[PDB]
Write a protein that binds this ligand. Structure first.
Ligand SMILES: [K+]
Ligand SMILES: [K+]
Ligand SMILES: [Mg+2]
Ligand SMILES: [Mg+2]
Ligand SMILES: [Mg+2]
Ligand SMILES: [Mg+2]
Ligand SMILES: [Mg+2]
Ligand SMILES: [Mg+2]
Ligand code: NA
Lengths: 204, 121, 38, 100, 144, 34
RNA sequence: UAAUUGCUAAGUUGUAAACGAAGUCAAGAAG
RNA sequence: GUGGUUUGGCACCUGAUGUCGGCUCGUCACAUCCUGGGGCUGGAGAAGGUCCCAAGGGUUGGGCUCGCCCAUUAAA
RNA sequence: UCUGGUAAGGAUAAGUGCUGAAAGCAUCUAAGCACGAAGCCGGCCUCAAGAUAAGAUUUCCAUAAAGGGUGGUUAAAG
């Protein structure tokens, strides 16, 4: 079970025992149930939650009808969560108090995008040779990519240059510092993937 | 941040003046040693009529680091030099005096006899 | 337990058994005669 | 060169019999294409996944290895129970022991 | 061995039904699963082959064990402290239904010989006898 | 020495034999297990 | 997916030895 | 008997199959260095020794050029 | 700077056993049954229906802004 969130930024606070704790602020916000999935119809149990208030200008007609059936105002982001203790119906509202009894949470996000990256940054390759001592033009080269005629191929899974970042990442077991229902705020110890303003999934 | 081939001042009244770090103890590929860490040293220079000989391999505990050290209360400390104190086989101070300040982290390193220090910071 | 290509009951008290396709020599009085791989 | 055979519905497929120790002793090997990527499985693993998977794996292998065989394997329907929905086709009951 | 008659005593009744043959007696009800090749109690081996003979002897011995279990039952005595109340895990040697136990020695009585042997083996597996010096769980050596 | 080994007999779910299940528990916590 | 009669239980098979145990089936000899 | 990893034998492929170490990047085997589980011990305990199962992950930096030495490490 | 790698859910290896014949004894095995490893299949993370066996659920359905495309202001996306 969990809720959708938005990353605000990082700060550092002082605990009760005088420890400087790095902290990520997350707006967890009121999530509305927009669909209940059941074993009989969908084949599995889950709840679909909507997070950020949208407008009819930015809601397509199919999604507008979906929200009309749910009898809620249109939402921008929808995500599914399973294993919800307690029954929830269509149009119910969940807030950051859902995490008021959790010591640790899981945060799923999309990491920052690096674009195309070479082997040195993407995979930590050591580079060919030294900066001097006869180096021509392979300071950031990969080196050899295989063996001789016996395999006569590059193996699948060989680490090469390519797109790095901008993908789904889960950070496990982040300690919860404080729940702030008056502002829908969640304070976690540590850092979470993505840039400020990205949408996060927070699982209990 | 002391590694192999780093030179340290010897901050006690034993004969050694300068020492060279041979190895940082504590695990495979352990790169750096900080305050309160135990290293192996080779003695590089001694005072005339010194108890310890030049070229003697010894153990030492790091007591001052130029690179800054972080404490859990959000504070940091850094020194102007890199200084160590020599130890015997039993793990005790080889000398009787300590010159200059030492880091407060040495209290918890089971190294309480460095309380000979003029000032613990 | 000793593994060899030729197992024999060197003593009357030794006994030969077959277990799951292998051959063992067992001796409860002295277990240092135990062998396998018949 | 023509798909000229029958459409076969097999019922009671979970009651098929394998002699000897072949239920767990017959080792099927496959490869994922990655280094160190050979994998093992058994007819028991197939049957646990479902009777149709084991039956398709066996019948393919006895079918011709071409486009016609790839199409022909799609005419085989395999069911664990006796409950299948193929009305309006009126399949006739064939005694399998009559064929030699 | 497998041909000797198996007399049923007084109070014990053995019923054969659907290869689930059960003997219900004074001290409990036990069950067994004979084969089609297998048939007081009088065994009958259909063939004289090796498999048939082995199965016949084994099944007759199992039936006799069942009869003894229902009629008289079985008991095993074994030789650090012990316990009397909690008969799941309450012995102290190092650190940290269908059977009856007594109050160091332990007497354990039951009607299923296989279960009694398994329980006794598990009880004795805590501390096997030590060749260096006589110590450990024993049923009621070498110099180092 | 408050910890203690706790092994309990229980019928098997796939065969039907009185198998054993073992776990470590506190000395006072053995009542909940058995 | 012929007919008849045996053997093998190792998937041996359907395309390496000295040396063990004799798993099984026959044919015997001494006692 | 097995292997082909040593020194060889043969001369079957080759109008070029072009070069020892080191670096980089690997991948596989198990004849197991460490970690995991066991049998025997001339195994009191603790250290070990030998054998069996087991290839998941790990498996240092230097002074010298297969090897020697210095300091480590669970192991090198 | 934060977080992670644990344990062993299931089946097993070498081994340890229960009951027990062939072979009135013995025997962990031939019928059955307990166990038992960083190894195997899972659990954890990411991808993943061109999985042509192309799956499921909710909603909407042709022309303006049912859906889109071209275009513009741009981006922690490239
Ligand atoms: K190739
Ligand atoms: K051939
Ligand atoms: Mg970017
Ligand atoms: Mg470089
Ligand atoms: Mg050059
Ligand atoms: Mg250059
Ligand atoms: Mg010639
Ligand atoms: Mg050419
Ligand atoms: Na073969």
């Amino acid at each position: 079970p969990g809720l959708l969130g938005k990353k605000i930024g990082m700060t550092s606070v002082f605990s009760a025992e005088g420890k400087n704790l790095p902290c990520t602020v997350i707006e967890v916000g009121p999530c509305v149930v927009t669909q209940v999935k059941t074993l009989e119809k969908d084949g599995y149990s889950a709840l679909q939650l909507g997070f950020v208030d949208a407008k009819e200008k930015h809601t397509t007609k199919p999604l507008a009808g979906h929200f009309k059936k749910a009898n809620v105002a249109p939402k921008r982001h929808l995500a599914e969560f399973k294993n919800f203790e307690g029954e929830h119906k269509l149009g119910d509202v969940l807030n950051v108090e859902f995490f008021s009894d959790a010591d640790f949470v899981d945060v799923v996000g999309t990491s920052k995008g690096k674009g195309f990256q070479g082997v040195v940054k993407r995979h930590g390759f050591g580079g060919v040779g030294q900066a001097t001592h006869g180096q021509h033009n392979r300071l950031r080269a990969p080196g050899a990519v295989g063996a001789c005629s016996y395999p006569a191929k590059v193996f699948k899974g060989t680490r090469m240059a390519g797109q790095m970042g901008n993908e789904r990442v889960t950070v496990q077991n982040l300690e919860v510092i404080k729940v702030m229902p008056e502002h829908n705020l969640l304070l976690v110890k540590g850092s979470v993937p993505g840039a400020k303003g990205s949408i996060l999934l927070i699982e209990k | 941040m002391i590694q192999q081939e780093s030179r340290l001042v010897v901050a006690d009244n034993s004969g050694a003046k300068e020492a060279l770090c041979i190895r940082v103890l504590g695990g495979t590929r352990r790169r750096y040693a900080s305050v309160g860490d135990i290293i192996v040293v080779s003695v590089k220079s001694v005072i005339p009529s010194s108890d310890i000989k030049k070229g003697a391999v010894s153990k030492a505990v790091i007591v001052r680091t130029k690179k800054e050290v972080r404490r859990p209360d959000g504070s940091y400390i850094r020194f102007d030099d890199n200084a160590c104190v020599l130890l015997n086989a039993a793990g005790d101070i080889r000398g009787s005096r300590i010159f200059g300040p030492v880091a407060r982290e040495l209290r918890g390193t089971n190294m309480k006899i460095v309380s000979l220090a003029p000032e613990v910071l | 337990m000793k593994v060899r290509a030729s197992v024999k009951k060197r003593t009357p008290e030794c006994k030969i058994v077959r277990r799951k396709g292998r051959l063992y020599v067992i001796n409860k009085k002295n277990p240092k005669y135990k062998q396998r791989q018949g | 060169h023509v798909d000229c055979g029958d459409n076969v519905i097999v019922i009671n497929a979970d009651k098929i019999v394998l002699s000897g120790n072949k239920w767990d002793g017959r080792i099927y090997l496959r490869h994922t294409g990655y280094p160190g990527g050979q994998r093992q499985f058994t007819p028991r693993d197939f049957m646990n996944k479902g009777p149709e998977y084991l039956f398709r794996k066996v019948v393919k292998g006895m079918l011709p290895k071409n486009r016609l065989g790839a199409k022909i394997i799609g005419n085989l329907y395999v069911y664990a129970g006796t409950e299948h929905k193929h009305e309006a086709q009126q399949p006739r009951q064939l005694d399998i022991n009559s064929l030699k | 061995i497998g041909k000797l008659p198996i007399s049923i005593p007084a109070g014990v009744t053995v019923s054969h039904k659907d290869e689930i043959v059960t003997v219900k007696g004074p001290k409990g009800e036990l069950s067994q699963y004979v084969d089609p090749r297998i048939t007081m109690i009088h065994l009958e081996r259909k063939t004289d082959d090796r498999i048939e003979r082995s199965l016949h002897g084994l099944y007759r011995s199992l039936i006799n064990n069942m009869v003894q279990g229902v009629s008289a039952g079985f008991k095993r005595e074994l030789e650090y402290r012990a316990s009397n109340q909690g008969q799941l895990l309450e012995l102290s040697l190092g650190f940290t239904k269908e059977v009856t136990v007594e109050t160091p020695l332990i007497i354990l009585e039951s009607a299923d010989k296989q279960l009694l042997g398994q329980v006794c083996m598990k009880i004795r597996s805590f501390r096997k006898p030590e060749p260096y010096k006589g110590k450990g769980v024993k049923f009621v050596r070498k110099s180092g | 020495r408050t910890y203690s080994k706790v092994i309990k007999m229980v019928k098997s779910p796939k065969t039907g034999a009185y198998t054993f299940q073992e776990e470590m528990v506190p000395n006072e916590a053995v009542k909940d297990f058995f």
